[PDB]
Ligand binder design. Structure first.
Ligand SMILES: Cc1cc(N)ccc1O
Ligand code: NI
Ligand code: NI
Length: 330
């Protein structure tokens, strides 16, 4: 109950940070894994904001406060946590860097911030759970339940003393960026993804796709959000496989709760059905990940390495199913 705020020592320490030279080159690539550099994650985000949006886009004090309060409002859950937030923001950075002048200054800043904030205060439960069992959140937010909460948490953090990184925007640009953010966060509801990707595919194939059309732009941004949210499937195989362990740790914990209330969980959230995971992963890649990156690659051809990597990981799950799997740790 309530918005957390970073300490003086936390945000002051971030202002001092400089990115090691070797990482400067690596951070540009789509497959970059932030995993091994935990101490550097806030500093990595500052760096990305500064390279994409400029060293004076935000007042440094307010941005450093904002980042450390966002960090503090992610929960210590196995997957929908601070590491996930920075991972999704890094994917967005790589997409924007490769497609830079397609997007406005306002869009780039709003989207980097939306990615960092997009799962704020996640409790490790799905929309399915909150709705099936009438959590107060599902009463307040009838659809896209958690995503509407993540947006509310973002606005709550911006409204903290010294935390409004957007306050120096004109009143018009301030409304615009908040709407960019709101739309981008709501688009991370995978329910909405299926229709969005279908709409985009048809627009692309008929030639009606037009990025000067605001509604088109919104949908393209929405698909970029999905692509970033799912980007664990675009990393090198060992990273992808380890990330899957974290994702399933959350699912299984939710499944246990459904059992307690007399409901058999979906097999995916059932820790007694781990044998079905490889087939489950295949389904997810075929129905969700491959289509997402295929459509994104059509619209933004520089994002092709995401699709290549996703295809590579699908081939690895197929190997698991055939029993060709080699050694892994946890
Ligand atoms: C359900 C799911 C699976 C994977 N591998 C990544 C993200 C997801 O939401
Ligand atoms: Ni989410
Ligand atoms: Ni997410």
């Amino acid at each position: 109950a309530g918005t957390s705020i970073c300490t003086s020592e936390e945000w002051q320490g971030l202002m001092q940070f400089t990115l090691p030279v070797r990482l400067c080159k690596e951070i540009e690539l789509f497959h970059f894994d932030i995993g091994p550099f935990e101490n550097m994650w806030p500093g990595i985000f500052v760096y990305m904001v500064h390279r994409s949006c400029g060293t004076s886009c935000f007042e440094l004090e307010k941005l450093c406060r904002f980042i450390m309060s966002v960090k503090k409002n992610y929960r210590r859950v196995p997957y929908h946590n601070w590491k996930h937030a920075v991972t999704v923001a890094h994917c967005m950075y790589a997409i924007l860097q490769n497609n830079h002048t397609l997007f406005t200054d306002l869009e780039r800043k709003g989207l980097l911030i939306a990615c960092l904030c997009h799962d704020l205060d996640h409790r490790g439960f799905s929309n399915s759970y909150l709705q099936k069992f009438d959590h107060p959140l599902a009463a307040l937010y009838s659809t896209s339940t958690m995503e509407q909460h993540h947006f509310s948490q973002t606005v709550s953090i911006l409204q903290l003393e010294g935390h409004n990184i957007f306050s120096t925007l004109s009143s018009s640009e301030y409304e615009q960026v908040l709407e960019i953010i709101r739309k981008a966060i709501i688009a991370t509801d995978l329910a909405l993804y299926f229709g969005n990707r279908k709409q985009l595919e048809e627009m692309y194939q008929t030639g009606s796709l037009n990025l000067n059309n605001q509604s088109h732009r919104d949908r393209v941004i929405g698909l970029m959000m999905t692509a970033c949210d799912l980007c664990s499937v675009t990393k090198l195989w060992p990273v992808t496989k380890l990330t899957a362990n974290d994702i399933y740790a959350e699912f299984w914990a939710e499944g246990d709760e459904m059992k307690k209330l007399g409901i058999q969980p979906i097999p995916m959230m059932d820790r007694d059905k781990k044998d079905e995971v490889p087939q489950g992963q295949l389904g997810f890649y075929n129905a969700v990940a491959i289509p997402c990156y295929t459509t994104l690659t059509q619209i933004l051809p520089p994002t092709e390495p995401l699709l290549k990597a996703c295809r590579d990981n699908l081939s690895q799950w197929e190997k698991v199913i055939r029993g060709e799997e080699t050694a892994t740790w946890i």
